[PDB]
Amino acid sequence: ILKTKYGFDNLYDTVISVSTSNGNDINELDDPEHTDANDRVIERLRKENLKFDPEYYVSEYMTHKYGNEEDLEINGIKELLKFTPSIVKQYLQWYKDSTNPNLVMPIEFTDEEQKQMQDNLPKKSYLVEDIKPLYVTILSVLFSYVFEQIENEGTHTTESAWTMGKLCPQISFLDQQLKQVNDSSLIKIAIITGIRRALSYPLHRNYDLAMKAWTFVYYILRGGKRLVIRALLDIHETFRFHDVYYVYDKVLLDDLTAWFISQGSENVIRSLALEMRKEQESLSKQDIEFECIASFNEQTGEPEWETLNIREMEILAESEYREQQQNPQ
């Protein structure tokens, strides 16, 4: 089989397979060295539908809506929903006082951030023709970062990169394509993907939580190039520090940060902020669908599949609960 290149500008190979021998549990591709771009999308979609747990989803929804104080305290959903990461607080505090808030947010890079850009990033020049997948990567990686920032209430854990890599299709599945072969639509796909993955992989699987994270991505993008760099440097450092997950910096994040710093466009970032917000606002629970196993054939073993959106799951759960509560058992 011919080798299939991956990562930034499809320049990398071998790195990912070697990492899987070192405990890389972020990678979700069965054969990263021999899976083409379209097959990565096919595998991802199949695995997302297998990963999604409707009972877990429904339980999370019911705890949030009907749980007592003890149930809500152990879960933590209400506290997460009130949390604002530091990067967002910086933007909101600036925005509140700015005389002209359509302009870009001023940023003075810290000593640590300057040392990072000097010592940790590649110094090569970039001549990338296809920039659209790179801006879409920035979008998906920003959602991963924001979601993690909320879920952990601004403190990183040993599993922060796992969270970031899992909600990011360009990382877990080395998928920069997102759409199967049979800008605006790709943006909408990136948003839906983020939501589907945020309801299938992390500890807290909540639609309102996923939408909160996308709203904060909008604000980061509105802040401008430098605010985006502040976020990218944080992401880069979280991966760099891990003895295993650093491979995602090697194959994607090292170049993406350095390319963005030297070639990122303020106009493109602003257009992206407005397009993603428009696409986000056009979405509802009815757009978030999964194929679920209803049963297994006893004689055959083939799972019997059924299609449901997240709202249908909630209604069915609310009906079961009302039957349990209204009627004596």
Site for another protein, rule CB under 8 A: 15, 17-18, 20-25, 53-56, 58-60, 62-63, 70, 73-74, 76, 152, 155, 157-160, 162-163, 202-203, 205, 243-244, 292-295, 304, 306, 308-309, 312-313, 315-317, 319-321, 324
Residue 264 contacts residue 256 (beta carbons within 8 Å)? no
C-alpha triplet 192, 233, 40: angle, nearest 5°: 40
Residue 93 to residue 77: CA distance in whole angstroms: 25
The two structure tokens encoding residue 185: 């639509």
Helices (H) and strands (E) in the chain, counts: 17, 2
- Least distance to another protein, CB of residue 159, Å: 3
CB of 62 to another protein, least distance (A): 8
> In terms of CB distance, is 11 or 92 closer to another protein?
11
Contact 142, 222 (CB under 8 A): no
* Beta-bridge partners for 289: 309
Nearer to another protein, 137 or 144 (CB): 144
CA distance 73 to 68: 9
Nearer to another protein (CB atom), residue 205 or residue 236: 205
Q: How far is the CB of 155 from another protein (least distance, A)?
A: 8
Q: How far is the CB of 270 from another protein (least distance, A)?
A: 35
| CA contacts within 13 A on the Cβ side of 164 | 31
Residues 6+ apart with CB under 8 A from 269: 221, 224, 225, 228
Q: Considering beta carbons, is residue 25 or 266 the nearer one to another protein? A: 25
Rounded to a whole number of angstroms, the minimum distance from the CB of residue 73 to another protein is 5
- HSE of 93, CA atoms in CB hemisphere, 13 A: 9
Give the nearer residue to another protein in terms of CB position, either 84 or 309.
309
Q: Which CB atom, from 169 or from 202, has the smaller least distance to another protein?
A: 202
Q: How far apart are CA 126 and CA 256, in angstroms?
A: 10
Q: How far is the CB of 53 from another protein (least distance, A)?
A: 6
Instruction: Say if residues 87 and 147 touch (Cβ distance below 8 Å).
Output: no
Nearer to another protein, 39 or 53 (CB): 53
Q: Which is nearer to another protein, 118 or 155 (CB)?
A: 155
C-alpha dist (Å) from residue 132 to 180, 183, 235, 268, 279: 16, 8, 20, 10, 17
